[PDB]
Amino acid sequence: ALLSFERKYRVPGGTLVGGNLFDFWVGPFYVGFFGVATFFFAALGIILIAWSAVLQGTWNPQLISVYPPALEYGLGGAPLAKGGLWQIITICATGAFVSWALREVEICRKLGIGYHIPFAFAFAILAYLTLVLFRPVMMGAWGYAFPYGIWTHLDWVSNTGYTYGNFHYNPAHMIAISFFFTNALALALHGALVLSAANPEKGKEMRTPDHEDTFFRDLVGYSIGTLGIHRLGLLLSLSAVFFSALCMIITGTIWFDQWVDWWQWWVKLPWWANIPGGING
């Protein structure tokens, strides 16, 4: 079925591979070559997980868990039951994600829009690839990647963090958190401003972007403007993820001791190093 305004846009073209061979839709969904690639990778991905369940002996979605190769396998392969599946499912995962970004690029091409979305997505894929691929490779084993399970992955988050003490003290992770919270601040506000203009007090006319600037200037002395705020949310959120990737890519590799102790560089700087008083002398 089609949105009332949709037919005019459903023209041939834009595909990156296969010419017209897969230039079509199922329902609302554009297919294309990467639609086929995505389905194939997802499907195989899920079948292997569905199998991996069998070998664990569970079907509960809160129990099912596909564990990476034990740390002693290094960066080699493991049997299906003992790590192999995870390795193949990560290949399928990456394949499905990257295929979905490239489908997105195809839709953009057909719709005549900019490529900002699949670019944005590429940051999520890179975070994932840090956790399952770049970090493990730099450390020397697939065992360091997180396992695929609803709870078991949270188990992994906590163990991983507590290896380095209170993980809060990772300074890239501090920056990352700041971007997440600021992004959420920005999203609340943006949502709230547009709606407060679109839906003004009872009986009144819709307000105007000038109302939106005025509101924020009156309140905080500044307005970024409507191009600004969309640039901002994109920047905040992509930055949150870039620092998330960074804070892990360094942990276990350039830094592997307790993160709290890193801050000693500043404390011990030579001018104030040996001044008595304070918390640290």
Binding site: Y30, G114, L154, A188, G191, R207, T214, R217, G221
Partner: protein, 302 residues
């Protein structure tokens, strides 16, 4: 290359925009501040004007008295030496009164009293500021969505520093004012309540925090992607749908099989965000009042 529109290629400037008047008492708006070419590549160059009525004066004054109260404590913790101050700045902490003083104000200044003072000031600052968010909306005839949204943030803050300590019977349950100390507090809180990863409200909060990043990446990337048809002009696209709104919908319909409207994306937005601190503050409010250990609760409740 194709131009991405994250920064602008040319800046234009015109006479300072003094704003819409509606019902705003103009006696209380400053004049425009400077223009910043730097901000200009990304957003608006113009700074100011700002509205400062009495409620705003209160909020700022109170806000400043808070920062100060902490600062006094810190410089004192630093034996008045600025070298030590700068060196240890993240290690200083203004801590609440001991468990032994319960909810009383009986504690010495150096051992609880100052913390109460600071918290008093922050309470006045935030609440007065909340009212500003409503009143500035009102003066212009706009909806109160901002003030409602802000209330959800206020909620988590209020739970952490006031409601939960009141329900637990002591100020010692509140968070200290300090950069490292408040992180330690956060860690400690989870350790002591059976690991907050077991708190279903904590999990929701994360879903929403992550989702806000997902959503705003989506949304912002989308408006930028359709900015060649005037996408960012969302109110007029609300009032009179254009090819920008349609290509945006259809990107998503063809990707994931459903999609938004220009106004509706902003309702997904406000809620995605607001549910962060809502769910968050429930999670915490229940922690230690009704549930001492989330691992344990989990075992007995699915």
């Amino acid at each position: 290359a194709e131009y991405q529109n994250i920064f602008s290629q040319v800046q234009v400037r015109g006479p300072a925009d003094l704003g819409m008047t509606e019902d705003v008492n103009l006696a209380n708006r400053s004049g425009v501040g400077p223009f910043s070419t730097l901000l200009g590549w990304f957003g608006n160059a113009q700074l100011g004007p700002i509205y400062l009525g009495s409620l705003g004066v209160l909020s700022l004054f109170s806000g400043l008295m808070w920062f100060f109260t902490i600062g006094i404590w810190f410089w004192y913790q630093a034996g008045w030496n600025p070298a030590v101050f700068l060196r240890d700045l993240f290690f200083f902490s203004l801590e609440p009164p001991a468990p032994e003083y319960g909810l009383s104000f009986a504690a010495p200044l150096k051992e609880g009293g100052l913390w109460l003072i600071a918290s008093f000031f922050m309470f006045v600052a935030v609440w007065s500021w909340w009212g500003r968010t409503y009143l500035r909306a009102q003066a212009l005839g706009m909806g109160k969505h901002t003030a409602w949204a802000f209330l959800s943030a206020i909620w988590l803050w209020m739970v952490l520093g006031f409601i939960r300590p009141i329900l637990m019977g002591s100020w010692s349950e509140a968070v200290p004012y300090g950069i490292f100390s408040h992180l330690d507090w956060t860690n400690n809180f989870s350790l002591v309540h059976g690991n907050l990863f077991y708190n279903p409200f904590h999990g929701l909060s994360i879903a929403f925090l992550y989702g806000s990043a997902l959503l705003f990446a989506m949304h912002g990337a989308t408006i930028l992607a359709v900015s060649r048809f005037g996408g960012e002009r969302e109110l007029e696209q609300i009032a009179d749908r254009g090819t920008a709104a349609e290509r945006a919908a259809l990107f998503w319909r063809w990707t994931m099989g459903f999609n938004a409207t220009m106004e509706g994306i902003h309702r997904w937005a406000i809620w995605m965000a607001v549910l962060v601190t809502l769910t968050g503050g429930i999670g915490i409010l229940l922690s230690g009042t009704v549930v001492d250990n989330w691992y344990v609760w989990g075992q007995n409740h699915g």
